[PDB]
C-alpha cells in the first residue's frame, strides 16, 4: 500500500531522548545535553547518572556537623539536586532568596577552606558555591528540587513555623476541582526566571503526592489534598506539560537546555491513585524514591529499600497480597518492582533508582528473625498519625526531627556513618554537637549492634537483641548488589538521599582513636563501578491510531484496576474486523490482564510468569486485542473497551496495528515513519 512520506528529523531533533514529548516546532537545543539518539552526555566519564540530593539545612550555624556545597564529591557525580524550594503564596518557586540570612543566597562560612564566596556573583550562600564548583566541573548538572514531604503543601516561616498554604495542591488545582491554569502559569514562568537567575540546569518536581488515594498526603495537607482527589492527576499533567512548554521555549531562546525531572513514588499503593502516570512523557528523567518502603510510621519491621521481593514482606502478608490468586505472586514493595512499573511509560535510559544514605528503625521489636519481618507497635503517635510503629530513639535516632514541644520524634533515623559507628561499638564524638546528652540512658551505647544481611532482599541491617532494636541500613554490600542490577538492566542511573549521610573512616577523629563520619564511600563505590567497564558483559511504516487508558475511579475504589481503553482511528481507512492491536504492558502487573467487554484481550507474550522472588524476569507482557471479525473501526471513529489488571502500570507503550497482513507502528510513537493514509 502507498504511504505518505515524512521529512526526516534534522539538527537538534536527532538528539531528542526516546519517547520524550517535545514542544512542537520549537527548536529545543537537545544536542547541548544529549547525544544523537538521545542518550545523555554525562559528567566525569560515567555510564550511569549518579544523582545526589544536597540538603540546604546542614549549615553548621547551630554547631551541628555542616555539609556544604564544597563537601560534595563533584568528581564522582553527574547531577546534584538542591533540596528544597517550595511553592510560595503567589504560586511561585521560592527559596526565600530575599530573606536576610537565608542559606541559599545570603550566608557565608568565614574560615572554612573551600567555602569562600565569589564576590562577582549577586548572591552568597549555597548557590554561590554551586556556581563556582560547576566551573571546575562543567559537565555536572544542578537542579532545583521543589516540594518534598514537609513543603509540598506549605512552607516554613522565619520562626520555623509551617504555613499551611496548600503548596502544589492549591497551585495545580482550584478549590472547585478545576485545574488552576493561572497558578501553573505563574509557577512555570517563575521556574524559568529562577533557572536563569541562579544558573541551574533544571527543575526537579518533588510533589508528594498527586494521587487520588484518600489520606495519602502529609497529614498536614489533608484539608487540601482530600478535597482534590479526583482532580490531582489532571492538575499534575497540566503542571508538567506547561513546565515542559515554558522550559523548551526558554531553552530555544537561551541556546542552552533545561531539564525537567521528578522525584516519583515507588509505592504501589500511591501509584494506584495515579492512573497511568501520563505525565512521564514530559520528564527528561525520573528519580524513583525506592526507599522509605518501610519505617516506623507503622509496625511492620523490615528493609527501608529492598531490591527484591522475598515472598515474606510482613505488610504484604497482612493484606493478603501473596495469597490472592489475581496478584500472581507478585510482591511490589521493592526497587525492582518500581523500576518495572516506570518502564511502562519510559525507556530505561530515563529512569534512575533511589537508594538511602540514612537509616530507619524500630525499638521493642517482637517476632521476625533478628527483627526482620517482626512487629513493633508504638504509642503516642506523631501528629497526624492514628497508629504508628515504636520508632527507635536517642543514640538510635540522631537525625531526628523535633515536634512542636521541642521533643525528639522517634523513628530510628541516622546518617550511615553513625550506623557504621554503632556496628563498631562507637557512640560517636559528634553526639553533643547534635544537642544529644550522652549521659542520658537512651543516648548511651547498650547491648551489641549485630550486622545482618539478606541477599534475597539486598538488605543490610543492625539488630540489637538486648534492646530489640532493628535499624535498616545501606552499605557497600547492598550498594554493590544494586549497582550490578543497575548495570545489567542498563538503568539510567542511581539517585541517593542525601549527600551528608555518606561515610568514611576518619582515623584522627575521637582523640586519634578514630570513628566514621561524613565521607564518600558509597558514592565512590557507585562512581568506580559506573566509570569503568561493566563486571558482567521493527515496523517500517506507521498508522495514526491513538490509544489511551482513562475513566479511572478514585484510588481507594480502584480494586481491581479497571480503566477504559479508547482506540481512535485517525487514518482515512476503515480498519476491518480482525485488525489486531498489540502493546507492551509493564511486568509490574501480573500477566493476567483481560477485558470486560467480550473482546478477548490477552497476553500473547509473557515477559514474567510465576513469583517475582529474585526479581521480575522481563520488562513487558505483550498484549493483543482484535476488533471482532464482524466489527470495523471507521475513519475518524473510536471504540472503547473495559480492561482489568491487578497492580499499577504506566504507559502502556510500543503499540502496533496489524492490518491486512502488515504490521504498523503508530504515529504517536513513530512520527517519522512513512504512514498509511488510504488503503
Ligand atoms: Cs575510558
Ligand atoms: Cs570536595
Ligand atoms: Cs572564590
Ligand atoms: Cs576570591
Ligand atoms: Cs520522600
Ligand atoms: Cs527528611
Ligand atoms: Cs498473603
Ligand atoms: Cs557488633
Ligand atoms: Cs527520604
Ligand atoms: Cs565480562
Ligand atoms: Cs464485544
Ligand atoms: Cs515479552
Ligand atoms: Cs526465582
Ligand atoms: Cs532478562
- Report the alpha-carbon distance of residue 81 to residue 70 in Å, rounded: 15
Residues before each break in the chain (C–N > 2.5 Å)? Answer: 537
378 and 350 co-located in one domain: no
Judged by its nearest atom, the ligand closest to the C-alpha of residue 360 is 9
531: CA distance to ligand 1 center in Å? 8
DSSP 561-573: B-PEEEEEE-SSS
542 and 643 co-located in one domain: yes
Q: Are the C-beta atoms of 151 and 96 separated by less than 8 Å? A: no
Q: What are φ and ψ of residue 224, in 5° steps? A: -90, -50
Q: Are the C-beta atoms of 655 and 545 separated by less than 8 Å? A: yes
> In terms of residues, how long is the chain?
679
- How many CB atoms lie under 10 A from the CB of residue 63? 10
Q: Are the C-beta atoms of 378 and 388 separated by less than 8 Å? A: yes
Q: Are the C-beta atoms of 660 and 576 separated by less than 8 Å? A: yes
Contacts of 381 (CB under 8 A, 6+ apart): 387, 388
528 and 558 co-located in one domain: no
Nearest to 420 by CA among 430, 411, 410: 430
Q: What are φ and ψ of residue 30, in 5° steps? A: -60, -30
Q: How far is CA 21 from CA 25, 72, 345, 668, in A?
A: 12, 33, 12, 10
Q: Which residues pair with 621 in a beta bridge?
A: 585
Residue ranges with strand state E in 503-544? 503-506, 515-518, 542-543
DSSP 485: H
Judged by its nearest atom, the ligand closest to the C-alpha of residue 585 is 12
609: CA distance to ligand 9 center in Å? 32
- Report the alpha-carbon distance of residue 511 to residue 620 in Å, rounded: 56
Q: Are the C-beta atoms of 573 and 677 separated by less than 8 Å? A: yes
Judged by its nearest atom, the ligand closest to the C-alpha of residue 608 is 12
129: CA distance to ligand 4 center in Å? 11
Residue ranges with strand state E in 174-297? 202-206, 259-265, 285-289
Helix (H) or strand (E) run with residue 21 in it:
none
229 and 240 co-located in one domain: yes
DSSP 298-346: SSB---SS-SSB-S--HHHHHTTTTT-GGGTT---SSHHHHHHHHTTTS
Q: Are the C-beta atoms of 303 and 368 separated by less than 8 Å? A: no
Q: How many independent structural domains does the chain possess?
A: 3
- Structure-block grid coordinates of residue 448: 551489641
120: CA distance to ligand 4 center in Å? 9
Q: Are the C-beta atoms of 490 and 534 separated by less than 8 Å? A: no
Helix, strand, or coil here: 667? coil
Domain end position, chosen among 491, 509, 537: 537
Judged by its nearest atom, the ligand closest to the C-alpha of residue 623 is 12
Q: What are φ and ψ of residue 408, in 5° steps? A: -55, 130
642: CA distance to ligand 6 center in Å? 41
Identify residues whose C-beta is under 5 A from ligand 13, the ion. Answer: 613-614
- Structure-block grid coordinates of residue 293: 518502603
- How many CB atoms lie under 10 A from the CB of residue 119? 7
Helix, strand, or coil here: 254? helix
DSSP 607-642: S--S--BT--S-SEEEEEEE--TT--B-TT-EEEEE
Q: How far is CA 356 from CA 47, 149, 294, 413, 414, in A?
A: 21, 15, 12, 11, 11
DSSP 573-591: SPBPTT-EEEEEEETTS-T
> 254-280: string of b/e by CB count within 10 Å (b at 16+)?
eeebbbbbbbbbbbbbbbbbbbbbbbb
- Report the alpha-carbon distance of residue 61 to residue 64 in Å, rounded: 7
- How many CB atoms lie under 10 A from the CB of residue 479? 22
Judged by its nearest atom, the ligand closest to the C-alpha of residue 311 is 7
Q: How far is CA 92 from CA 96, 450, 536, in A?
A: 11, 48, 47
- Report the alpha-carbon distance of residue 385 to residue 369 in Å, rounded: 27
Q: Are the C-beta atoms of 43 and 139 separated by less than 8 Å? A: yes
- How many CB atoms lie under 10 A from the CB of residue 125? 23
Q: Are strands 638-644 and 620-626 parallel, antiparallel or unpaired?
A: unpaired
557 and 514 co-located in one domain: no
315: CA distance to ligand 7 center in Å? 9
612: CA distance to ligand 13 center in Å? 7
494: CA distance to ligand 1 center in Å? 20
Q: Are the C-beta atoms of 28 and 251 separated by less than 8 Å? A: yes
534: CA distance to ligand 10 center in Å? 7
Judged by its nearest atom, the ligand closest to the C-alpha of residue 607 is 12
Alpha helix (H) ranges present in 165-211? Answer: 167-172, 181-198
Q: Is the peptide bond before 441 cis (omega within 30 degrees of 0)?
A: no
Helix (H) or strand (E) run with residue 654 in it:
strand 653-659
Judged by its nearest atom, the ligand closest to the C-alpha of residue 128 is 3
363 and 447 co-located in one domain: yes
- How many CB atoms lie under 10 A from the CB of residue 334? 28
Cβ burial, residue 187 (10 Å; 0-12/13-18/19+): buried
Helix, strand, or coil here: 405? coil
DSSP 439: T
The vertex-223 CA angle with 221 and 228, nearest 5°, equals 95
631: CA distance to ligand 11 center in Å? 9
- Report the alpha-carbon distance of residue 250 to residue 259 in Å, rounded: 11
Q: Are strands 542-543 and 662-666 parallel, antiparallel or unpaired?
A: parallel
Resolution for this model in angstroms, one decimal place?
1.8
142 and 232 co-located in one domain: yes
Domain end position, chosen among 515, 537, 559: 537
529: CA distance to ligand 1 center in Å? 13
- Report the alpha-carbon distance of residue 643 to residue 560 in Å, rounded: 10
399: CA distance to ligand 6 center in Å? 9
Q: Are the C-beta atoms of 361 and 467 separated by less than 8 Å? A: no
Nearest to 420 by CA among 518, 280, 554, 345: 518
Q: Which residues pair with 666 in a beta bridge?
A: 543
Judged by its nearest atom, the ligand closest to the C-alpha of residue 129 is 3
Domain range spanning residue 35?
1-356+475-537
DSSP 447: S
Q: Are the C-beta atoms of 418 and 500 separated by less than 8 Å? A: no
405 and 517 co-located in one domain: no
- Report the alpha-carbon distance of residue 103 to residue 52 in Å, rounded: 19
43 and 160 co-located in one domain: yes
- Report the alpha-carbon distance of residue 221 to residue 166 in Å, rounded: 7
116: CA distance to ligand 3 center in Å? 5
Judged by its nearest atom, the ligand closest to the C-alpha of residue 532 is 1
Judged by its nearest atom, the ligand closest to the C-alpha of residue 583 is 12
- Report the alpha-carbon distance of residue 342 to residue 330 in Å, rounded: 16
- Report the alpha-carbon distance of residue 250 to residue 242 in Å, rounded: 12
121 and 202 co-located in one domain: yes
Judged by its nearest atom, the ligand closest to the C-alpha of residue 308 is 13
614: CA distance to ligand 14 center in Å? 12
Q: Are the C-beta atoms of 50 and 79 separated by less than 8 Å? A: yes
Judged by its nearest atom, the ligand closest to the C-alpha of residue 618 is 14
The most distant pair of C-alpha atoms in the chain lies apart, rounded to whole Å, by: 85
Q: Are strands 545-550 and 594-595 parallel, antiparallel or unpaired?
A: unpaired
Q: Are the C-beta atoms of 530 and 523 separated by less than 8 Å? A: no
Q: How far is CA 443 from CA 44, 379, 397, 427, 578, in A?
A: 41, 20, 9, 9, 71
- How many CB atoms lie under 10 A from the CB of residue 630? 7
Identify residues whose C-beta is under 5 A from ligand 11, the ion. Answer: 598
Judged by its nearest atom, the ligand closest to the C-alpha of residue 206 is 5
Domain end position, chosen among 474, 491, 518: 474
The vertex-582 CA angle with 579 and 586, nearest 5°, equals 165
Contacts of 317 (CB under 8 A, 6+ apart): none
- Structure-block grid coordinates of residue 12: 537538534
CA dihedral over 108, 113, 114, 120, signed as positive or negative: positive
616: CA distance to ligand 13 center in Å? 9
- How many CB atoms lie under 10 A from the CB of residue 510? 17
Nearest to 292 by CA among 333, 262, 261, 330: 333
271 and 315 co-located in one domain: yes
131: CA distance to ligand 3 center in Å? 10
Judged by its nearest atom, the ligand closest to the C-alpha of residue 613 is 13
- The experimental method is X-ray
C-alpha 547 chain-centroid distance: 26
Identify residues whose C-beta is under 5 A from ligand 3, the ion. Answer: 116, 118
Helix (H) or strand (E) run with residue 61 in it:
none
Q: Are the C-beta atoms of 308 and 613 separated by less than 8 Å? A: yes
177 and 295 co-located in one domain: yes
Amino acid at each position: 500500500p502507498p504511504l505518505v512520506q515524512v521529512p526526516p528529523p534534522t539538527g537538534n531533533a536527532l538528539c531528542r531522548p526516546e519517547a520524550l514529548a517535545q514542544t512542537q516546532g520549537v527548536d529545543v537545543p537537545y544536542c547541548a545535553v544529549y547525544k544523537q539518539g538521545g542518550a545523555e552526555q554525562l559528567a566525569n566519564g560515567s555510564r550511569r547518572r549518579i544523582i545526589g540530593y544536597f540538603t540546604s539545612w546542614r549549615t553548621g550555624k547551630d554547631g551541628s556537623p555542616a555539609y556544604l556545597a564544597s563537601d560534595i564529591p563533584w568528581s564522582k557525580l553527574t547531577h546534584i539536586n538542591y533540596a528544597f524550594a517550595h511553592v510560595d503564596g503567589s504560586n511561585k518557586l521560592s527559596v526565600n532568596e530575599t530573606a536576610p540570612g537565608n542559606p541559599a543566597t545570603d550566608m557565608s562560612w568565614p574560615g572554612v577552606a573551600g567555602a569562600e564566596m565569589d564576590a562577582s556573583l549577586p548572591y552568597k550562600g549555597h548557590f554561590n558555591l554551586l556556581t563556582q564548583y560547576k566551573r571546575k566541573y562543567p559537565g555536572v548538572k544542578t537542579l532545583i528540587s521543589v516540594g518534598g514531604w514537609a513543603e509540598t503543601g506549605g512552607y516554613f516561616d522565619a520562626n520555623g513555623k509551617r504555613v499551611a498554604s496548600g503548596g502544589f495542591y492549591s497551585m495545580t488545582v482550584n478549590a472547585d476541582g478545576t485545574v488552576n491554569q493561572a497558578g501553573i502559569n505563574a509557577f512555570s514562568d517563575s521556574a524559568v526566571a529562577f533557572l536563569r537567575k541562579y544558573g541551574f540546569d533544571g527543575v526537579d518536581i518533588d510533589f508528594e503526592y498527586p494521587t487520588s488515594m484518600n489520606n495519602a498526603g502529609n497529614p498536614l495537607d489533608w484539608t487540601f489534598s482530600n478535597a482534590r482527589l479526583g482532580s490531582l492527576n489532571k492538575g499534575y499533567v497540566a503542571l508538567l506539560q506547561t513546565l515542559r512548554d515554558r522550559l523548551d521555549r526558554a531553552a530555544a531562546q537561551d541556546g542552552r537546555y533545561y531539564q525537567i525531572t521528578a522525584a516519583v513514588p515507588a509505592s504501589g499503593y500511591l501509584l494506584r491513585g495515579m492512573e497511568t502516570f501520563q505525565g512521564l512523557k514530559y520528564l527528561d528523567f525520573v528519580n524513583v524514591m525506592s526507599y522509605d518502603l518501610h519505617g516506623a510510621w507503622n509496625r511492620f519491621v523490615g528493609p527501608n529499600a529492598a531490591l527484591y521481593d522475598d515472598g515474606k514482606d510482613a505488610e504484604l502478608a497482612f493484606w493478603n497480597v501473596y495469597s490472592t490468586p489475581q496478584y500472581g505472586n507478585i510482591g511490589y514493595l521493592n526497587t525492582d518492582w518500581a523500576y518495572h512499573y516506570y518502564r511502562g511509560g519510559l525507556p530505561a535510559s530515563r529512569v534512575n533508582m533511589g537508594v538511602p544514605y540514612y537509616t530507619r528503625g524500630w525499638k521493642n521489636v517482637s517476632g521476625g528473625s533478628n527483627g526482620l519481618w517482626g512487629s513493633s507497635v508504638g504509642s503516642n503517635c506523631p501528629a497526624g498519625l492514628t497508629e504508628c510503629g515504636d520508632g527507635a530513639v536517642g543514640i538510635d535516632n540522631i537525625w531526628h526531627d523535633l515536634d512542636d514541644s521541642g521533643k525528639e520524634i522517634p523513628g530510628g533515623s541516622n546518617p550511615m556513618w553513625h550506623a557504621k559507628n554503632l556496628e563498631k561499638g562507637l557512640a560517636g564524638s559528634y553526639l553533643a554537637a547534635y544537642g544529644i546528652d550522652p549521659t542520658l540512658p537512651i543516648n548511651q551505647l547498650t547491648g551489641s549492634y549485630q550486622r545482618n544481611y539478606n541477599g534475597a532482599l539486598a538488605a543490610p541491617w543492625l539488630w540489637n537483641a538486648g534492646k530489640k532494636v532493628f535499624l535498616s541500613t545501606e552499605d557497600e554490600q547492598s550498594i554493590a548488589q544494586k549497582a550490578a542490577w543497575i548495570d545489567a538492566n542498563n538503568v539510567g542511573g542511581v539517585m541517593f538521599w542525601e549527600l551528608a549521610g555518606d561515610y568514611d573512616w576518619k582515623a584522627q577523629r575521637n582523640n586519634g582513636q578514630g570513628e566514621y563520619f561524613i565521607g564518600t564511600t558509597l558514592t565512590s563505590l557507585l562512581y568506580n563501578t559506573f566509570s569503568q567497564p561493566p563486571k558482567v558483559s521493527a515496523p517500517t511504516a506507521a498508522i495514526d491510531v491513538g490509544f489511551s487508558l482513562g475513566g479511572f475511579k478514585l484510588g481507594d475504589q480502584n480494586y481491581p484496576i479497571n480503566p477504559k481503553l479508547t482506540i481512535v482511528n485517525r487514518s482515512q481507512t476503515t480498519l476491518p474486523g480482525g485488525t489486531e492491536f498489540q502493546f507492551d504492558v509493564p511486568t509490574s502487573a501480573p500477566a493476567n490482564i483481560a477485558d470486560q467487554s467480550g473482546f478477548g484481550l490477552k497476553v500473547v507474550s509473557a515477559g514474567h510468569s510465576g513469583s517475582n522472588v529474585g526479581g521480575l524476569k522481563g520488562d513487558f507482557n505483550r498484549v493483543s486485542v482484535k476488533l471482532p471479525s464482524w466489527q470495523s473501526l471507521g475513519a475518524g471513529q473510536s471504540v472503547t473497551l473495559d480492561v482489568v489488571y491487578y497492580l499499577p502500570i504506566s504507559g502502556p507503550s510500543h503499540y502496533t496495528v496489524g492490518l491486512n497482513g502488515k504490521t504498523y507502528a503508530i504515529r504517536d510513537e513513530a512520527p517519522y515513519l512513512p504512514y498509511l493514509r488510504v488503503l
